Design a protein around this ligand. Sequence first.
Ligand SMILES: CCCCCCCCCCCC
Lengths: 182, 616, 59, 19, 43, 54, 381
Amino acid sequence: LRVKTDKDLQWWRTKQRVITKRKSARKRDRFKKQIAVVNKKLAALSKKVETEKSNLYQTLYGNYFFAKKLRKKISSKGRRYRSLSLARYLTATRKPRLVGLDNLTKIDNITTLQGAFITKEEKQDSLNLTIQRKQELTNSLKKSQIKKRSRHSWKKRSRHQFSRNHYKYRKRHTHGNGKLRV
Amino acid sequence: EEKPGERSGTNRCVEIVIEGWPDVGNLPTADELKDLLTVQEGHIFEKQDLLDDRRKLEIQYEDYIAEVEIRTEYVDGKSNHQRVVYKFTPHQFRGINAIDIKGAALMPASEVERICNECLPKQPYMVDIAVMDKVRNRIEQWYQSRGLPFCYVGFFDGMDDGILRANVTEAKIDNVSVRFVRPKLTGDSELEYSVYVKADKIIEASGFQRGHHYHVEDGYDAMNSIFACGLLEDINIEPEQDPVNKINVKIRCEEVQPKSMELDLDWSFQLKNGIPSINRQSLIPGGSVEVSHENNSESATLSLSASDWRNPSADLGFSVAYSEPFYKPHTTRNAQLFNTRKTSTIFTPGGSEVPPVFVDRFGLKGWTSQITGQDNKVEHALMLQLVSTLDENGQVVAKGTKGPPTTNSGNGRDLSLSYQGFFALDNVRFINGNQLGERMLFQVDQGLNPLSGGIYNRATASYTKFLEAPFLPKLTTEQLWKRKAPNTVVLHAKAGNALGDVAAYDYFSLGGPYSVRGYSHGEIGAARRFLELATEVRVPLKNYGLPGTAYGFVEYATDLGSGRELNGNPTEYYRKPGRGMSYGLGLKALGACRFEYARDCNAGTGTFLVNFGERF
Amino acid sequence: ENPMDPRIRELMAAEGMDDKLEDEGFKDTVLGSAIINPYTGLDMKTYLDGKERHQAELV
Amino acid sequence: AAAFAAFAGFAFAAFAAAG
Amino acid sequence: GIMPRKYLIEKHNIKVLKKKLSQAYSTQQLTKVVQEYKNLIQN
Amino acid sequence: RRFLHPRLDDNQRRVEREEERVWALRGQQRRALGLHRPHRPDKDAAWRLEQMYD
Amino acid sequence: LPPMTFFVEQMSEGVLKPEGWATMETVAGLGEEVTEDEGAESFNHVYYRQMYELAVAGDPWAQREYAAMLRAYDKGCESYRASYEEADVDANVEYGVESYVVDPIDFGPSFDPEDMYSHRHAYAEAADAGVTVIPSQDYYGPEHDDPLNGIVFQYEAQPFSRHGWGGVPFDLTVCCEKDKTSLCLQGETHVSLVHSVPPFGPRHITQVTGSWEVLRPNIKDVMYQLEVDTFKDGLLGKSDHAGCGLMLARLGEGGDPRKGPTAVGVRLQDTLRVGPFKLEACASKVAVQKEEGWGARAFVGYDWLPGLGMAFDFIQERTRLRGYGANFTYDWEALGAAFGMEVDYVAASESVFVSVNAFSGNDYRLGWLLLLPAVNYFKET
Ligand SMILES: CCCCCCCCCCCC
């Protein structure tokens, strides 16, 4: 009946696996609780303290009983416990393409005919030019291609697989730095 | 919260005067700086506010300003109202006469003249140090807009002769190197690396030649060319400056480990009283044992599940997945062995108390799918599957009973091998939230079964045209180009024909929410040949400023009197062979949700309905 | 008794920390190449900074 | 156990409402 | 190159007064004395 | 095979033409300001990159 | 009406925590970067409300603070408006007239063409509407049509707030499945109320939830449930997270029960640290209209063995079969693999279940480790 006077971060990491698995450790006749009245669709009222503790919401100004114009939603870093991101998967594969407005190429930042990037006024100027000289109503290439299933099967199959394997190895759900921060 | 609000009081600031603030323009203007102060006009203040403002202003604008002094003078002695004056003294040069830029070979002379004319000092004496920073900022902005990040202003000279000259130093790629790394797997939450395609091949694909300028688009293209190889997992490129014109590009690459294994084990012990007995534990259930191997690239996932140990012959399950991403240029080939169960509505329609039947298909399918162009899809599939029928509990049913035959063999379970071709072409485009164009869909199912499936040929052709309304005048979204969704008329024609002997599981039918609104699935008819014609008018509500659109549809389905030709004549059994014509009016809300009231003239019953997904 | 605002204080503390890092980097790149005591690898930077006991414990 | 549970619930509710 | 520096004599005087009152174990007089000194500066 | 096979292929070829146009414009971007070649990948790398994010 | 065991299981969920307020990022920092920390946001809410009250009273400092807050809020709002306009212009520039399309929902493998019916679910991206729409998938669907039937709407708001400070958190969820034959309507609403904050007192929160279910053709009866829960921290110590809740369930035809079967339940929740044990307990008692059921759940941890997780459950029926269950969980790392074990012991049936999950990502050593079932498998004729 003695308290552990010396506490370490690794002890907290070890306890975090138990903390995460306590959600599934609850077993009853219906296993996970909070089902509906006469249907199997589980109700969203799972106000567990562990889950709700690391929950942050924002009142974003979305405009374009009172009117209540402001909209409540999650934004920025979702988790309440912030941790340093792993230095990986920074590079992204991108394909050059033409904007619908004009011959302006667009890979990441939009680039005009010259080497310089397009400016704020130049975009409006191009829009006005294309309004004044509109043509090709329908006979043109289709922008915003209709995505189909199995598209980018390589991406759907192997992208970020090592991260999933690492998560399966860890099963901690909190990287640890957020605890020190708080 | 403003000046007129509190005219009278004590120790209240009346006016804020800013003097000595540099007029370079790169820094915020006088009013912009006033709007960011702690002291506000018409509000109480103390000495702490003045000290905090002085410290903050000194810290945030350290380079330009040498000293900021805040003083207070009484407007009137008795009123106690005061005026707060800010005086700024920046660092200055004893004399600057002309400005010049040296180097910068890539920059044309026009920009050189423009930047020189932009930063002309007004007075040749006591010139502040903001001019050199402005020139540097302009040059850096020009070069960064051009896309070169490493072209920077070196330093400034000519101060002895009073000629502020900015010597721009350019940089070029000098050395390119490669490193091979492998990350390990552990629960330590801190990845460790082990340092170990041809390196020359990587260099050639990147195409980083010495003595060339570095550009962001060049880096993106090199990254794309390097990652074009599917074997590599992660890539990283960094153009670090060499300790000045030399840029050393470092490339780091890591491969992917394809092996993966998932194991499960379940135990059950009859404790009774005291310690349990382990002698009888010959074996234990092993759950599902999953083996995956990604390795060009060939996905291979096997999953074998045993319900219990010491007897795997009962309640066993197998699933196999194979995919080859790079087998063909624009085509991918996959093979899946699996099972699936789904209820049947055409065979056992309600409109009565007909119990539904559940079809179960377990087998293998190998198909090649190609995406030609952007919206054109071609799929060819060969599938061999055991098809069975079970109602309620898992018991095979010989034939449907309220009796039409359930399958072709008559035993409720058979094996069928068949070929299926799917061709989809789409010119439909969504402009301003409204879709216009044409879409063709062709499905062919040929049963090369000569083994109870038999010879069967099912052909389905669907043509949908979203056309601008001829009566409606041209909208502003087409001419002005800028914000209106055009009114649309949708004409849809679906034709389905079946030949040969086809089992009731795959029999063509007519009805269902998608095919004809207002009918339950199988209500209209179940015939080998059918024709569905739908005409809809869709109008956006953007003119009234209301979200969503309003539409009205009329659909007619005709079975061409093929119900009698159908084996067993199911339509006669349930006594609903009548052709249907249903018309309705609906509103499509945000997204694809639709709420429509539809009336069917066959029985004169109107009903509301809500659906998710586009009508056509 | 009129103290400085805590936000400014913390910001300036962080700026001083990065300035100290820059100073340490410059001192290393200027003086760390020389050798004072070859038996313990005592460079000139640590010797002139008064951190000889650091090297003595490190060995 | 019913009486103890009811009494504990009532006492907890009263204590929470008092503050 | 004008780098300002201020002559801080009143601050040092207040600090020395605080030190002298601390050495006499009469800190309760601090707020009584120092305030008066500040008034002496004003007029 | 007499109708579907050419038609869609035409569109595919059409798309290819448009793609080439883009690169031509990129060349102009490299032509101005004396920039070096963008080292465009080969078609063998391109069709593989179709499976990628591209 | 469901049995009292279902209600006792619903009530004994565990330690709960109601949702707090939401805060803007621009106004809170007065245009400066901020981090996340609870207690400093509800303080900002109540503090700005009190300062508004004092400024109305006449205190000049409160007026100055409120004026600064108003200036920051106006600047943030104008910045967001400019950002929205710029984003719209950029979206127009990228795609001239073509609205963005959405990826269709992937159902899975089947013998039907996998690419079929993809066009139906590909719709133009909706505007920045407050509501959220999700499709519902039924178990068995039509053979030749999409298996998606019904829809569910989810909405959240914090109304009655002034300048982004204060308000009443409010959540709503409605699942609607309407066809020519059936009708399924399931609604749920949550409302939060805050009484005090740590700077101005204790943490006192009250959450009110109301859920109703209607199944027209099959059941022809509606069900209502209303629960009120009160949470306060540090009731018997520095922190105990005490909570007490009361629920009422009715199965009347419409509105009032009108002789419909009613049920009343009450729950208590508390966590306490005694010696090396941090114990969390939740006990509830439910009475239907006349059997009474009791339920209790406890989570127990030992700081010397953080890797072991222990949960205890006790359920008592009306007087009086008592079911006791104990669950232990543990984890370890094998050679190139991770093994997690769970042991569940029930004394009512005198049964023990042991489950061991294994994951290996380096090689197939575990596969060669287990080969008994291959020999155990026999043709047997
Ligand atoms: C407005 C007074 C503050 C306390 C209100 C308590 C209301 C809930 C108590 C009854 C439910 C257990």
